[PDB]
Symmetry: C3
Subunit: 270 residues, 3 copies
């Protein structure tokens, strides 16, 4: 009889609708689980002067100077002189140890990325009773933000956790190219971080044998390129799109069901 076939068609269509609802729910759940990553790049005419927190310890800073695209040859390596850059010395308790006080030398970083500005730092360590001598350094976004802060100690403690710290060793020239990566936390706040490319070059020590005891650290900081990399977690689970899909599919199924009923009626009539 036609009635049983029509009822079976209705049941099949309702089962298809239920399965489609299940599939849409599972897809929405899956897309909530895994947001997709999108990467863009931002051109900058001038970077904001980064803060370079150096942790020399007993290593005295011989020289710190800004250069453009090239470093003039050293007049006399291992000798103090030519310190033209803004520096701030800070003492702050380590956020993790709570016992070791860190003394940091904050140096204002380069700004003209287009002009290939670099900052060159020369340190000397004299008679260190410790093999594997290296200087720690941390990079943060703004030196001015460090200056115009009410709690510089708290700012440095926050930097200890927000940013990563690297090292540069003596007997080398360490060339550091910096890059800014800003990650959107889809909450109105963006986390900025530094990615640094390091190249070490041997230092040709032409000092007298007596002066070989003191060891020299050379480090250069510049920007890799005038591109800030922005990383955003795009959500592909839109409830309105899902409900629009469901509504359209339900309307299609209802229209198909009533077309089937009309076709059955037409077959019965003729």
């Amino acid at each position: 009889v036609f009635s049983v076939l029509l009822i079976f068609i209705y049941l099949l269509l309702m089962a298809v609708a239920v399965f489609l609802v299940y599939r849409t729910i599972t897809d929405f759940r899956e897309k909530l689980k895994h947001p997709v990553m999108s990467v863009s790049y931002k051109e900058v005419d001038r970077y904001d002067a980064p803060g370079i927190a150096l942790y020399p310890g007993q290593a005295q800073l011989l020289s710190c100077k800004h250069h453009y695209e090239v470093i003039p040859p050293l007049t006399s390596p291992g000798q103090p002189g030519d310190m033209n850059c803004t520096t701030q010395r800070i003492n702050y308790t380590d956020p993790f140890s709570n016992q070791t006080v860190k003394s940091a030398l904050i140096v204002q970083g380069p700004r003209e990325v287009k002009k290939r500005e670099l900052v060159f730092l020369q340190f000397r360590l004299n008679k260190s009773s410790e093999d594997f001598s290296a200087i720690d350094y941390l990079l943060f976004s703004s030196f001015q933000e460090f200056l115009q802060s009410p709690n510089r100690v708290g700012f440095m403690q926050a930097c200890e956790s927000a940013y990563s710290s690297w090292k540069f060793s003596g007997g080398f020239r360490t060339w550091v190219k910096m890059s800014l990566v800003k990650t959107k936390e889809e909450d109105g706040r963006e986390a900025v971080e530094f990615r640094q490319e390091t190249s070490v070059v041997n230092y040709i020590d032409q000092r007298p044998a007596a002066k070989k005891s003191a060891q020299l650290f050379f480090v250069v900081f510049e920007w890799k390129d005038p591109f800030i990399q922005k990383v955003q977690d795009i959500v592909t689970a839109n409830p309105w799109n899902t409900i629009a899909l469901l509504c359209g599919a339900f309307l299609a199924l209802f229209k198909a069901a009533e077309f089937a009923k009309l076709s059955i009626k037409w077959m019965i009539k003729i």
Copy 2:
């Protein structure tokens, strides 16, 4: 006449429907071609002890010891002593050469990433007739998995292809920070790999001139951060979503066609 205009409207709507079907098919084909990448991060309280397969050759292991956040100064570099770590020596044929047998020293890696655990290894090579002396090392996920295996040789041969191997040279201290990246192969299997950040520091050789002939390798392994990076290939080509779009568009086109016919009839009647 109104009939010709209505038939032309029907033909235009059917052509639009066909073009929309073509566009949807092309979009589904394109989305099948290029799945989108999604990156997430996993917090870990404790890492599973990684296996560090070292290939020293004739270089004897002076020392291997676990430290926390800092390495105590060497009592006497170049002298054996203080070997507290679990190691396993293995001999296995190279999967690619089929002739060169590799002898590997498997070392259990650090676990407490939160406590900044590191493993410090000191090797000595005495009178090597080969310039550019370096030790190969490979990283795999679990030392325990290596232990509780029926074919350790086959496990090492599989590691030779699954993981990448790096080198650390003498006259340096090589600081290696490890990171785990798990890539989903959308097939029920996930491929795990190691990404390592390497920083070399000069070793200040304060040995007697006689002892300068033997060269020393210092390497440190720890974890960069308590974050495992998961990378998944999300497919954006859902056949059910595409068929729902097509059904909704077809219903819209049919309803618009019958509205147009009704409007033509209303214009004719009045």
Copy 3:
């Protein structure tokens, strides 16, 4: 009265439709703002011979030779001999300085990635009055494309801007593993770039004290793996999908409105 309730229902449904249109427009605008990144990998049986533009300056090239998976020990470091590779010397004005003419030594790179082909280069610098001695190098895709070009000078000037240049220093062996990353610019053009992993190994100088003045550069170029990484910016803003969603939702809303009117009529009648 039922009429006021029905009119209020119609107004509510039209407001819902307007809000849904607003949401769809905002979603389309957002998806236009941020295309999603998709990463794939391409297997290669043989790479196209890359061009390695070396900038030695006064450093003479002692040796340049192709090896497979291993470098034979040096017969006599610091001595010329065994130069078997195709090289081209070029002079071109620096695109940025417009005054400094760069002299480049273009070397044909390795091809058999499967066979682990590498190219080994040995340079010597004799009595350089400049500390921090290093040689610049740039990588571009094809040496043949450099050969079969009408303006080699213009090709090199374009490479100065299209590709990135690194350095390798004396007193080391610099192991460079190359990788090709092709980014689709969604405009019919793809930008190819080189990513290089560098490992430095100490050179054990066993030369006489007289010969220690001349400094030696050792560099190796090979391919990291037979995988070319393709990065594409997929656009998730399809106007046809959006209009299909809107049409389906509008049909659903109209059908719901007429169902509501019919239900009100049925309630009034009985």
